[PDB]
Amino acid sequence: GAMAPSYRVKRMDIAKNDEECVVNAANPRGLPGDGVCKAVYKKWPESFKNSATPVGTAKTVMCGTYPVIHAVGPNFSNYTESEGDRELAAAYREVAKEVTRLGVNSVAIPLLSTGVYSGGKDRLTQSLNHLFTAMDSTDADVVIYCRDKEWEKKISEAIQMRT
Ligand SMILES: COc1ccc(C(=O)NCC(N)=O)cc1
Ligand SMILES: COc1ccc(C(=O)NCC(N)=O)cc1
Ligand SMILES: [Cl-]
């Protein structure tokens, strides 16, 4: 574990992380996709060998020795708010099991079920609270990667609020 487990947020490309493993905002089919998924595909394409996995699950594939944890958040265009919420919580619980299993001291993570999976809605608070619920019991340093200047501020405030 980390000596004093922490949360941090950075506004930059998760493909340039300084952590021991990465969480991909994957699709269920292991396709290159767009946004974070496409950035992960460009940096670690070997990790998309048999990466397909259902909604609400996480599947780890090694790129060399570097673990990519493919986490599949629901697409809120297809799910009810109720069922979407349940699957988004579940995907994060599966990320926490994999981070633990791998024995890493740090993990880079994006906010799942945002952007194209958001169903046209700001889900910063919903996605961040499910991330905390899952990762609070892990001792890895968690570095959250974001792509909105306002989101960086709000995520940073939510981390400080709890400390
Ligand atoms: C390539 O990864 C990133 C990382 C961050 C951003 C971003 O913050 N864009 C919105 C803005 N410039 O306010 C975009 C892409
Ligand atoms: C109002 O609909 C939306 C839908 C999606 C977002 C969102 O995820 N923004 C952050 C990002 N692009 O990473 C915000 C608002
Ligand atoms: Cl960058």
Side-chain angles (χ1 to χ4, degrees), residues 84-102:
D85 186 66
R86 192 186 68 80
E87 292 292 7
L88 177 58
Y92 278 121
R93 292 194 298 274
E94 299 304 308
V95 166
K97 294 173 191 178
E98 286 295 280
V99 165
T100 300
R101 188 185 57 79
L102 290 164

Side-chain angles (χ1 to χ4, degrees), residues 24-125:
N24 185 25
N27 56 75
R29 315 206 161 253
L31 294 162
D34 318 87
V36 164
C37 191
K38 176 157 74 144
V40 171
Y41 184 76
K42 292 194 193 167
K43 182 58 64 176
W44 306 281
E46 301 88 342
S47 75
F48 291 64
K49 197 146 176 286
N50 294 310
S51 59
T53 196
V55 175
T57 76
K59 190 168 184 182
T60 302
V61 182
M62 312 296 288
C63 173
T65 73
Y66 188 78
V68 180
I69 306 170
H70 299 272
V72 186
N75 172 5
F76 276 106
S77 291
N78 297 335
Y79 281 92
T80 62
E81 290 281 343
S82 152
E83 199 67 22
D85 186 66
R86 192 186 68 80
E87 292 292 7
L88 177 58
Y92 278 121
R93 292 194 298 274
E94 299 304 308
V95 166
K97 294 173 191 178
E98 286 295 280
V99 165
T100 300
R101 188 185 57 79
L102 290 164
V104 295
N105 290 333
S106 62
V107 52
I109 188 153
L111 291 187
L112 299 181
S113 285
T114 56
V116 286
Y117 279 30
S118 82
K121 288 206 170 191
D122 176 345
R123 294 185 186 275
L124 185 173
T125 297

